[PDB]
């Protein structure tokens, strides 16, 4: 977690449930990453406990998430002089989208009790709209390189953490040990506890 900083100054690293300064000593597993874009006026909307229009119908963040995001300004990656209309978003939904649930929406949303599945020219509204990425909107509408990272402290063997090297095993002295991210103080001795290796 040290090659992460060569991608311009960031509008992120405000981390809940994890310390951004200490990212190598702790060990965990099962890290999931997703990639999308944000407008810019709602960078802080990607947070647990926040519910509005953004991150309520596209990607809802759960209250118990213990993770954070990385994000910075995109001025040359995808913003062009002719504009960019690559990304879309969901306008209307029947209810709040459950977190960690990928969804697709192309069908026509209705705002009444009349039958409407594909009929236009009425109050039925298309639930998608095209992002206009232009340099003329400095803060209001700008592409961003936002990526969400998810972490969990499940009862699983540790897989991904810092590249810090190990040391030689020592016995008969009570010290602090870091065994697969488990912090504790005690003495290490040969154990007579023998069980099935599972």
């Amino acid at each position, epitope marked *: 977690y040290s090659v992460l900083y060569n991608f311009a100054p960031f509008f992120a690293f405000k981390c809940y449930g994890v310390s951004p300064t200490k990212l190598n000593d702790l060990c965990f597993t099962n890290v999931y990453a997703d990639s999308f874009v944000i407008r810019g006026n709602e960078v802080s909307q990607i947070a647990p406990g926040q519910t509005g229009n953004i991150a309520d119908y596209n990607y809802k963040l759960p209250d118990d998430f213990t993770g954070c995001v990385i994000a910075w300004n995109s001025n040359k990656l995808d913003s*062009k002089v*002719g504009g960019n*209309y690559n990304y879309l978003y969901r306008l209307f939904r029947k209810s709040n989208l459950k977190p960690f649930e990928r969804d697709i929406s192309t069908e026509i949303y209705q705002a009444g009790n009349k039958p409407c599945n594909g009929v236009a020219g009425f109050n039925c509204y298309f639930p998608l709209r*095209s992002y206009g990425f232009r340099p003329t909107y400095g803060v209001g509408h700008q592409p961003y390189r936002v990526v969400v990272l998810s972490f969990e402290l499940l009862h699983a063997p540790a897989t991904v953490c810092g590249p810090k090297k190990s040391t030689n095993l020592v016995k008969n002295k009570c010290v602090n040990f870091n065994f697969n991210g488990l912090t504790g103080t005690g003495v290490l001795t040969e154990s007579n506890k023998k069980f099935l290796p599972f």
Partner: antibody
Amino acid sequence: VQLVQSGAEVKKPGASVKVSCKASGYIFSDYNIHWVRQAPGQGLEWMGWISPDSDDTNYAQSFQGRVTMTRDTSITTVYMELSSLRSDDTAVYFCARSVGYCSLNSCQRWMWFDTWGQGALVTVSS
Amino acid sequence: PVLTQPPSASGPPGQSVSISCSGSRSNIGTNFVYWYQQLPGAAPKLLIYKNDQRPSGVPERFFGSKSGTSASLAISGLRSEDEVDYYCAAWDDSLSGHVFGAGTKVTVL
């Protein structure tokens, strides 16, 4: 501004002809480009689209493998070939451009041909 | 495929002529239809797109809107703007591409 397309004269059916589209004024690295042809006595028929920045290529349902769409930023032009031309599908080719930059099916709803580059009317005769 | 529109549309100036663009379910209603007017030997021109906002230099007298499974357009005043055919432009998933009209041959009378 407006675009140009270099065509050929009347040739025999059953051969290969190479066309080109060269941009003018603007930088040809930001604009999605389309293709379309108009049969004599009939409306326009959609062909497909590419982009001169990446390997995104789509065709119509009738000419999926008949033509090859090539791009090259260094010469700043786009070539297509027509292998074994018939006597019905030969038509004027519009080097149409669309604003923005995408290659998604759902993106095509908010894409319109803002300006139309004039092309060459090509025909075939043995 | 090909759209069904009456090609032999004509009439004396001073009245209103209405043309309707037939289409399938995925072509009109789930997408935004456009209208292209083309000239022989030159580039076409844009008049109606998304049926609610107009380009620069396009007169307000052109009227094209959708109200169901088939969009419709109406013309009024045949002096120069109705001297050449129009095209019904839409998008659908039947061929994963844009569709064009067959040509509404309207001249000046």
